[PDB]
Design a binder for this molecule. Sequence first.
Ligand SMILES: *[C@@H]1O[C@H](CO)[C@@H](O[C@@H]2O[C@H](CO)[C@@H](O)[C@H](O)[C@H]2NC(C)=O)[C@H](O)[C@H]1NC(C)=O
Ligand SMILES: *[C@@H]1O[C@H](CO)[C@@H](O[C@@H]2O[C@H](CO)[C@@H](O)[C@H](O)[C@H]2NC(C)=O)[C@H](O)[C@H]1NC(C)=O
Lengths: 49, 50
Amino acid sequence: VLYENQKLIANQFNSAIGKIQDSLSSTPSALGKLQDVVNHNAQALNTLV
Amino acid sequence: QFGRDIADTTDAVRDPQTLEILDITPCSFGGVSVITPGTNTSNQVAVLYQ
Ligand SMILES: *[C@@H]1O[C@H](CO)[C@@H](O[C@@H]2O[C@H](CO)[C@@H](O)[C@H](O)[C@H]2NC(C)=O)[C@H](O)[C@H]1NC(C)=O
Ligand SMILES: *[C@@H]1O[C@H](CO)[C@@H](O[C@@H]2O[C@H](CO)[C@@H](O)[C@H](O)[C@H]2NC(C)=O)[C@H](O)[C@H]1NC(C)=O
Protein backbone atom coordinates (compact mmCIF):
# COMPACT_ATOMS: atom_id res chain seq x y z
CA VAL A 1 0.00 0.00 0.00
CA LEU A 2 3.04 2.30 0.26
CA TYR A 3 4.08 2.96 -3.35
CA GLU A 4 0.53 2.98 -4.76
CA ASN A 5 -0.09 6.53 -3.46
CA GLN A 6 3.40 7.75 -2.55
CA LYS A 7 2.74 11.24 -3.93
CA LEU A 8 -0.61 11.34 -2.12
CA ILE A 9 0.88 10.36 1.25
CA ALA A 10 3.76 12.81 0.68
CA ASN A 11 1.23 15.60 0.11
CA GLN A 12 -0.73 14.45 3.18
CA PHE A 13 2.46 14.50 5.28
CA ASN A 14 3.31 18.01 4.05
CA SER A 15 -0.26 19.14 4.81
CA ALA A 16 -0.01 17.64 8.31
CA ILE A 17 3.32 19.41 8.88
CA GLY A 18 1.82 22.72 7.78
CA LYS A 19 -1.29 22.12 9.91
CA ILE A 20 0.72 21.40 13.06
CA GLN A 21 2.97 24.40 12.33
CA ASP A 22 -0.15 26.57 12.18
CA SER A 23 -1.72 24.92 15.24
CA LEU A 24 1.39 25.35 17.41
CA SER A 25 0.94 29.14 17.22
CA SER A 26 -2.83 29.18 16.64
CA THR A 27 -3.57 29.46 20.37
CA PRO A 28 -1.46 30.61 23.34
CA SER A 29 -2.84 27.82 25.58
CA ALA A 30 -1.36 24.79 23.78
CA LEU A 31 1.72 24.77 26.05
CA GLY A 32 -0.14 24.66 29.34
CA LYS A 33 2.20 22.32 31.22
CA LEU A 34 5.38 24.40 30.78
CA GLN A 35 3.53 27.61 31.66
CA ASP A 36 2.00 25.93 34.73
CA VAL A 37 5.32 24.60 36.06
CA VAL A 38 7.09 27.92 35.37
CA ASN A 39 4.30 29.87 37.10
CA HIS A 40 4.35 27.40 40.02
CA ASN A 41 8.11 27.86 40.49
CA ALA A 42 7.76 31.65 40.19
CA GLN A 43 4.90 31.72 42.71
CA ALA A 44 6.87 29.49 45.10
CA LEU A 45 9.82 31.89 44.90
CA ASN A 46 7.46 34.87 45.30
CA THR A 47 5.81 33.48 48.43
CA LEU A 48 9.26 32.46 49.71
CA VAL A 49 10.51 36.04 49.50
CA GLN B 1 12.15 58.18 49.67
CA PHE B 2 12.81 54.60 48.55
CA GLY B 3 11.50 51.96 46.16
CA ARG B 4 10.62 48.27 46.26
CA ASP B 5 10.21 45.29 43.93
CA ILE B 6 8.24 42.04 43.68
CA ALA B 7 10.23 40.69 46.65
CA ASP B 8 9.20 43.71 48.81
CA THR B 9 12.88 44.42 49.54
CA THR B 10 15.11 47.47 49.25
CA ASP B 11 16.36 48.05 45.70
CA ALA B 12 16.42 51.86 45.30
CA VAL B 13 16.62 54.77 47.74
CA ARG B 14 16.80 58.56 47.62
CA ASP B 15 19.65 60.16 49.55
CA PRO B 16 18.55 62.65 52.24
CA GLN B 17 21.32 65.14 51.37
CA THR B 18 20.98 65.53 47.58
CA LEU B 19 18.45 64.68 44.85
CA GLU B 20 20.36 61.86 43.10
CA ILE B 21 18.62 58.48 42.82
CA LEU B 22 20.55 55.47 44.14
CA ASP B 23 20.28 51.72 43.57
CA ILE B 24 20.82 48.90 46.07
CA THR B 25 22.10 45.51 44.88
CA PRO B 26 23.84 42.89 47.05
CA CYS B 27 27.42 42.01 46.19
CA SER B 28 28.83 38.64 45.16
CA PHE B 29 28.01 35.66 47.39
CA GLY B 30 27.17 32.00 47.06
CA GLY B 31 27.86 28.47 48.19
CA VAL B 32 31.39 27.25 47.52
CA SER B 33 31.81 23.94 45.69
CA VAL B 34 34.69 21.45 45.60
CA ILE B 35 35.99 19.04 42.95
CA THR B 36 38.31 16.26 44.12
CA PRO B 37 39.47 12.94 42.62
CA GLY B 38 39.40 11.26 46.03
CA THR B 39 41.96 10.64 48.75
CA ASN B 40 42.86 7.18 47.38
CA THR B 41 44.09 8.60 44.04
CA SER B 42 45.65 12.06 44.50
CA ASN B 43 45.53 15.13 46.75
CA GLN B 44 45.09 18.11 44.39
CA VAL B 45 41.71 19.83 44.64
CA ALA B 46 39.85 22.35 42.47
CA VAL B 47 37.78 24.87 44.45
CA LEU B 48 34.69 26.26 42.70
CA TYR B 49 32.50 29.29 43.39
CA GLN B 50 28.93 28.64 42.24
C1 LIG C 1 -8.10 9.83 0.31
O1 LIG C 1 -8.13 10.99 1.16
C2 LIG C 1 -7.26 12.05 0.74
C3 LIG C 1 -7.35 13.13 1.79
O2 LIG C 1 -8.63 13.15 2.41
C4 LIG C 1 -7.68 12.53 -0.65
O3 LIG C 1 -6.79 13.55 -1.10
C5 LIG C 1 -7.55 14.71 -1.51
O4 LIG C 1 -8.23 14.48 -2.76
C6 LIG C 1 -9.03 15.59 -3.21
C7 LIG C 1 -9.73 15.15 -4.47
O5 LIG C 1 -9.03 14.09 -5.11
C8 LIG C 1 -8.14 16.81 -3.42
O6 LIG C 1 -8.95 17.92 -3.78
C9 LIG C 1 -7.36 17.13 -2.14
O7 LIG C 1 -6.44 18.19 -2.38
C10 LIG C 1 -6.60 15.90 -1.66
N1 LIG C 1 -5.92 16.18 -0.41
C11 LIG C 1 -4.59 16.26 -0.30
C12 LIG C 1 -4.05 16.56 1.07
O8 LIG C 1 -3.85 16.10 -1.27
C13 LIG C 1 -7.67 11.36 -1.63
O9 LIG C 1 -8.16 11.78 -2.90
C14 LIG C 1 -8.53 10.22 -1.11
N2 LIG C 1 -8.47 9.08 -2.01
C15 LIG C 1 -9.55 8.38 -2.38
C16 LIG C 1 -9.29 7.23 -3.31
O10 LIG C 1 -10.67 8.65 -1.98
C1 LIG D 1 22.44 70.10 51.87
O1 LIG D 1 23.74 70.71 51.93
C2 LIG D 1 24.55 70.50 50.77
C3 LIG D 1 25.89 71.13 51.05
O2 LIG D 1 26.87 70.72 50.11
C4 LIG D 1 23.85 71.08 49.54
O3 LIG D 1 24.63 70.81 48.38
C5 LIG D 1 24.90 72.03 47.64
O4 LIG D 1 23.69 72.78 47.37
C6 LIG D 1 23.92 74.01 46.67
C7 LIG D 1 22.58 74.70 46.55
O5 LIG D 1 21.82 74.17 45.47
C8 LIG D 1 24.56 73.72 45.31
O6 LIG D 1 24.85 74.95 44.65
C9 LIG D 1 25.85 72.91 45.50
O7 LIG D 1 26.38 72.55 44.23
C10 LIG D 1 25.58 71.66 46.32
N1 LIG D 1 26.81 70.93 46.56
C11 LIG D 1 26.93 69.61 46.40
C12 LIG D 1 28.27 69.02 46.69
O8 LIG D 1 25.98 68.92 46.03
C13 LIG D 1 22.46 70.48 49.39
O9 LIG D 1 21.77 71.10 48.31
C14 LIG D 1 21.66 70.66 50.68
N2 LIG D 1 20.36 70.03 50.56
C15 LIG D 1 19.22 70.63 50.92
C16 LIG D 1 17.96 69.83 50.73
O10 LIG D 1 19.20 71.77 51.37
